Ligand binder design. Structure first.
Ligand SMILES: C[S@@+](CC[C@H](N)C(=O)[O-])C[C@H]1O[C@@H](n2cnc3c(N)ncnc32)[C@H](O)[C@@H]1O
Length: 420
């Protein structure tokens, strides 16, 4: 209302140009602020432009010099500490150049990320989805960074970081904010740090989106990808995001069947386990491990990775195909490979039942094992979803979690049907 007008004046001040066809709004959006079409917009049409000088990053912030100098000491797994420090500084700086931009940020105490749920609820509602494991990894990293890197830096520079921002609670919130708002510019292999992009981060997300961002030398442009009728919300794409990633990083899910990009994971070692099951002799077991190490050699599998299965097609396509091939090939043929190019081809809803029986059997057994990692079967979740009055009675978190589990189990059951 007031903050929106103030933000738009700031836009004018920093050269951020919005098309007259778009409006920043809180009415009729899927969530909080969003952008709507004042007038019908056509595909290819420029929606807005953001000068690179208006981005908020470790480089444009007022302590960019100090941060760059100390880059080595600020390294971490995420690579997000300098941006986080940039944010913590600007937030406590009396004359921050981005104040009107911050004014549109969500209430930091009300973020919906599962990292903010009680651990029991998280573990209970999201078992098997990959979220609980990702979150505990996040919390571990956050913890080490804070005590060994961030807090000491802030304390080494009292003038640049006031007391009110030396807060673990705040640090957690800002990590979540970066996860859900920041943009990472593609390279061209030292990946670009994430940056905050004003205006662009007003747009909500859909798998079926109608806008996307383009990078240029001097600016970022948000452009329409489909026509957008008058009064309709303008949706960016945050990526090809499965529900488990949306809930983890953004604190929301798309209800079924909306998320055409949804996926399920089969752990790579679970396929190995399935292969071992069918073995009888300890000598058969080791040929399996032999096959496995050859696949690790080829960098097609790894002890900690997962194959990724989409609704219509496998995403980790060559990895899975190459694994199935190598695991099911005659012992003889495998000798000639360990001595003397990877496997091509797609794996889709239509292709999979035409694969060799042995590949299908291996895939089938790995899927059964994956489905066993969840607390309940598909039928239970399908029951909660089919009856809308029962669904409506679940808490918000339970609804979100059910959508993650359901999306994943449906994909896995589809694959179960396809592999007979
Ligand atoms: C880049 S911000 C988008 C602007 C945001 N609506 C706001 O008011 O600040 C990303 C956040 O918006 C929300 N969001 C984006 N798309 C959504 C969707 N399709 N459904 C529900 N929430 C969504 C989530 O809270 C997510 O963390």
């Amino acid at each position: 209302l007031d903050p929106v007008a103030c933000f738009l004046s700031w836009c004018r001040r920093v050269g951020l140009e919005l098309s007259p066809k778009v409006a920043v709004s809180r009415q009729g959006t899927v969530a909080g602020y969003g952008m709507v079409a004042r007038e019908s917009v056509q595909a290819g049409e420029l929606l807005f432009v953001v000068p690179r000088a208006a981005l908020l990053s470790q480089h444009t912030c007022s302590i960019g010099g100090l941060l760059e100098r100390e880059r080595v000491a600020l390294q971490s797994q995420s690579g997000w500490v300098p941006l986080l420090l940039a944010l913590l500084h600007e937030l406590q700086a009396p004359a921050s150049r981005w104040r009107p931009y911050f004014a549109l940020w969500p209430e930091l105490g009300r973020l919906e990320h599962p990292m903010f749920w009680p651990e029991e609820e998280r573990r209970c509602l999201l078992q098997g989805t990959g979220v609980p494991e990702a979150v505990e990894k996040d919390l571990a990293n956050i913890r080490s960074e804070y005590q060994s890197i961030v807090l000491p830096f802030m304390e080494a520079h009292p003038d640049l970081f006031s007391l009110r921002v030396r807060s673990l609670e705040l640090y957690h919130q800002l990590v979540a904010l970066v996860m859900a708002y920041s943009f990472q510019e593609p390279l061209e292999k030292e990946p670009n740090s994430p940056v905050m992009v004003p205006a662009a981060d007003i747009l909500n997300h859909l798998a079926n989106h109608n806008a996307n961002l383009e990078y240029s030398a001097n600016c970022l442009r948000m452009v329409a990808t489909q026509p957008i009728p008058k009064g309709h919300e303008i949706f960016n794409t945050y990526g090809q995001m499965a529900n488990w990633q949306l809930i983890h990083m953004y604190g929301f899910v798309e209800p079924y069947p909306d998320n055409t990009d949804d996926t399920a994971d089969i752990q790579m070692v679970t396929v190995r386990e399935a292969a071992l099951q069918g073995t009888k002799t300890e000598a058969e077991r080791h040929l399996v491990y032999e096959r496995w190490d050859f696949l690790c050699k080829l960098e097609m599998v790894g002890e900690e990775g997962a194959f990724v299965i989409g609704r219509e097609e496998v995403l980790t396509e060559e990895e899975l195909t190459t694994t199935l091939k190598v695991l099911c090939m005659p012992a003889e043929e495998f000798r000639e490979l360990k001595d003397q190019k990877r496997e091509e081809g797609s794996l889709t809803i239509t292709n999979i039942p035409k694969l060799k029986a042995s590949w299908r059997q291996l895939l089938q057994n790995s899927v059964l094992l994956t489905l066993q990692t969840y607390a309940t079967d598909l039928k239970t979740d399908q029951g909660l979803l089919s009856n809308k009055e029962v669904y409506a009675k679940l808490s918000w978190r339970e609804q979100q979690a059910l959508q993650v589990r359901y999306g994943q189990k449906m994909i896995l059951h589809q694959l179960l049907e396809l592999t007979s």
